[PDB]
Amino acid sequence: LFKPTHLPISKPFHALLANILSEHQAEVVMNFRDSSYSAEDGGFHPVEIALSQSSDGQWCIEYITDFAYVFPELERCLDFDFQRGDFFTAYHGWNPIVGNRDARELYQLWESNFLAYVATEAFDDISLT
Template identity: 45%
Template sequence: MRIHYDGLALPVSTKLVHQLQNLLNQNQIKSESVTLNFRDPTYSAKRGGFHPVEIRLEQHDNMWHFCYITDFAYIGSGPYAELTKELDFDFQSGVFQNLFGVFPIEQATDMYQIWEGNFLYYYLELEAFTVSISE
């Protein structure tokens, strides 16, 4: 089954789609929705590291569709640090959210391209993430 990415409000790359498609095929997903979690096992508020990322896909008309891509980060310091959404690209609602507010998703094009390039580098080149998939 393919992932739909043509005509989205943000320029999701073929490279990202192929990586996600490979993960779906390797895990033989049977449900109509899936959440992919990319985690740096050493990431913490104290030591930093690579931000956790969550990608949600749902099936419609024999095709996977992006629901959202969320990048999390610790906000605050010391014992008060909380894991919070830092960047949220919500394809279903058509909004982009960051620490400064909520905006139409189309305003996040430049931010998304930078984020995606970094994410793919961390995932493919640095092998920074462990991946878990929940259906």
Template identity: 45%
Template sequence: MKLNFNKVQGLPVPIELFEIINQSLTGTPLPKGDFNSVTLNFRDPNYSSDNGGYHPVEIRLEKQNELWQLVYITDFSYQGGTFPELVKEIDVCFISKQVFNVFIGWLQNRNAKELLTLFISNFIAYYANDCYQVSVSVD
């Protein structure tokens, strides 16, 4: 399955990200009939609070007028001392055009775009190095 994207996302998104999404969907059995959202989960099976590794990333898309729109991209990491929990470290909301960082809070404008650019370029590099296992769910 190949999705057609709305390329105007409100925040800068390189074409490589859309290619990764479509590549991840290739060969994925999807239900017959209509569905209006797709969630992709990218996980490093060796990532843990003790050993580190590549943070899990979740990407959600929703269908709008035959085109697919990015809703969010979230990077999770273990945070906390004795009992670390998996929390949102970076959360990109394309609806509000804001980027959240666990250490700074909500960012807008230039700061949001700079963090998003760095985050996505790292994600693309990690994906290219085969660091993730991908799972897909639809609603």
């Protein structure tokens, strides 16, 4: 139903995505928010994920962005941009994803964390647009 990218996106992550699509279905942007998250209380970083519906029928993950407070505003914190083939961190800057090992480990850790947060209902506000 989703395929494919150069990062090891998990079956559980596809299942989360798949679930939220059809839950709403009965080009798309998902937002995950912890309404309590503040600049010096902490909480869980908001996450945005973008998907578009392919020509052949199956969905494509466009990008994944995790935002955090950095006078504080929300800045991209981690970004995995599949459309463009780049990832971002405030430390790493922009680097290509393909055969890149920092990208892989960073993504696996990010995704394991995010899936834990979701499964324990860390986000009181999940919207689809």
